[PDB]
What does this fold into?
Amino acid sequence: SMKQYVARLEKDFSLIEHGFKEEEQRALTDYKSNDGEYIKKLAFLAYQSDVYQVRMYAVFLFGYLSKDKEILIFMRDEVSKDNNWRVQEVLAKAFDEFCKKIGYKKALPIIDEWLKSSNLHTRRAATEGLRIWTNRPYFKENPNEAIRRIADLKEDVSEYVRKSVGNALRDISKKFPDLVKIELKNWKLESKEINQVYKLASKFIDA
Ligand SMILES: [Cl-]
Ligand code: NA
It folds into this structure.
């Protein structure tokens, strides 16, 4: 039964102290081996586990299932409430999986929606999940479309978000240093928040 399978996952995954590949691989196999109706039921049951590793497994399933708007909304609104930081990392990966499946250019309205969400975890999942942004389709040929979107969050009230924003710009600066330099030149570094983001973003820029 489904309940018995979740119990097995709890026994097996609770031993895993680091990483995410074991949970990811199992989620992928299960997603590919069963019809969507079944796997959606399993993902919701697994996500209620008190074992965070099993919730990680469930959020990978959500990512594979995320063409279903109901699943994507649950990711946006409910998984974003998870108190476990490792689950939050998987949320970022599952969002990236959504974007990859529908296509990054086609995903832009959703990316913009998540970046403007009220939940800081929703904003961070988008910023972090797409790193390195300019390695992704669309953004790799249009790097300012990534830089501008990330830089919009440079005054975010959340330090969690700001660290992701600064790091995401930092990523891009390693392959497009002039474009990041050009973006940063306009910043008025007056707040504690923007200076934190600037310090992360500008490490490899000859400003
Ligand atoms: Cl990457
Ligand atoms: Na990553």
The chain is about 65% helix and 0% strand.
